[PDB]
Design a protein around this ligand. Sequence first.
Ligand code: GPP
Ligand code: GPP
Ligand code: MG
Lengths: 218, 209
Amino acid sequence: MMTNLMLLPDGMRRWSQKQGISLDDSYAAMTDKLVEFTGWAREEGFTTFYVTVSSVANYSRSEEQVTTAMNAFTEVVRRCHDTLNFNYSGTLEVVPERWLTELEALRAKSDSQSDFTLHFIMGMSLAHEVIGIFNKFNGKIPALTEELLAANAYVPEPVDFLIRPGGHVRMSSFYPLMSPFAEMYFCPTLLNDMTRADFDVALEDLRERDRRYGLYPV
Amino acid sequence: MTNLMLLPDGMRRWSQKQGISLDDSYAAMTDKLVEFTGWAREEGFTTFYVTVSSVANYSRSEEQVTTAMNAFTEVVRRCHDTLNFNYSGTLEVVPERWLTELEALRAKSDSQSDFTLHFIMGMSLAHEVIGIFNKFNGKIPALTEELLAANAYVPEPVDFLIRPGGHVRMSSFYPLMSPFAEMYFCPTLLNDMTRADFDVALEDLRERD
Ligand SMILES: CC(C)=CCC/C(C)=C/COP(=O)(O)OP(=O)(O)O
Ligand SMILES: CC(C)=CCC/C(C)=C/COP(=O)(O)OP(=O)(O)O
Ligand SMILES: [Mg+2]
């Protein structure tokens, strides 16, 4: 069984306020922690490590906040892109061109033959995703099929495991469209405080679960 | 003007725990759901959503589908006279007998009640999107957030979502247009849920913001 993993990052402002440090340093710690998380996910045999980078609404923040966040996320790819396959998707039209250009170049320079993939999803929002798909195919086809929908969703496959640190038990705009049976794990520990042990007990929890897919066992 | 959504789970597990049949466990679920509707109404929620089934659920055996659909329909048989009942979802995968009875019960419900019980059947974001597209294909210049919200299975954003039974997952029950929904999971099986469990769940959900 080949599994994949998805991380929902949040709590950089909470960590910066809690520590009495700047938002920029909090995001630098987020970059370090995300490099760590990518390493851990690769060590644990996950085929793809998904990171829900941002929602559409996040790009309504101030220019500086968007620059800091997008730079922090991009630095992860700058550091690890040489040894893995990098890809990205989402509501790309709301992402500033600077980051689309740099992330495209980094995607071109990544090892597309690697057995491990880091995938960023930016501008996540089920409303915008569905509206984009509908408008793309509106009137041009007799009916939308599961295959087309799967081929045009932001996340190109069902997600197996989903982890959200930071104490919020909610999905926000990050729920994957084609993942009805994804397993969810929440923990109060902030992302920048997550240790390898926290990750490991999370994986104990997630791998302990019996996956039914809506059916009774046989 | 708040609403609540319940994801039922733990009927087979409860039947095994109590040493009873699946039908008996689902009868206990019927009683428990009548109770839950009462609790939700007393707490001021305008609409109580219950995720009856997913698309995958109808791939179960005929006996299992009949047991579940009968218990859920029995809830409406008991409560339809005192509240407003409505339903939605991927209706084409629901057996016609149950759609017929549920439609008749919806027509007989109190459409003037300030409280609504709403079943969603055959839940699946893929099938929901496919159905919306097929419904509006070529009939509109472009899909808007307003139209999408007006035609999704759940017709409004969900405030609170509760899943007892110990499984931390949506199992195809995620409400499409609820980006700000708060989720509460608890290990207590649905059939073991008391009013106090509901109340502390509401404490947890209301403490957050
Ligand atoms: C393009 C942009 C702006 C991306 C935003 C990056 C992000 C995941 C912020 C969430 O953390 P938070 O600081 O908002 O959480 P908290 O307030 O709890 O610290
Ligand atoms: C039409 C159908 C089949 C509806 C199914 C409704 C449902 C998800 C019940 C959950 O309890 P359960 O039956 O899965 O019990 P348990 O959690 O113990 O397996
Ligand atoms: Mg179940």
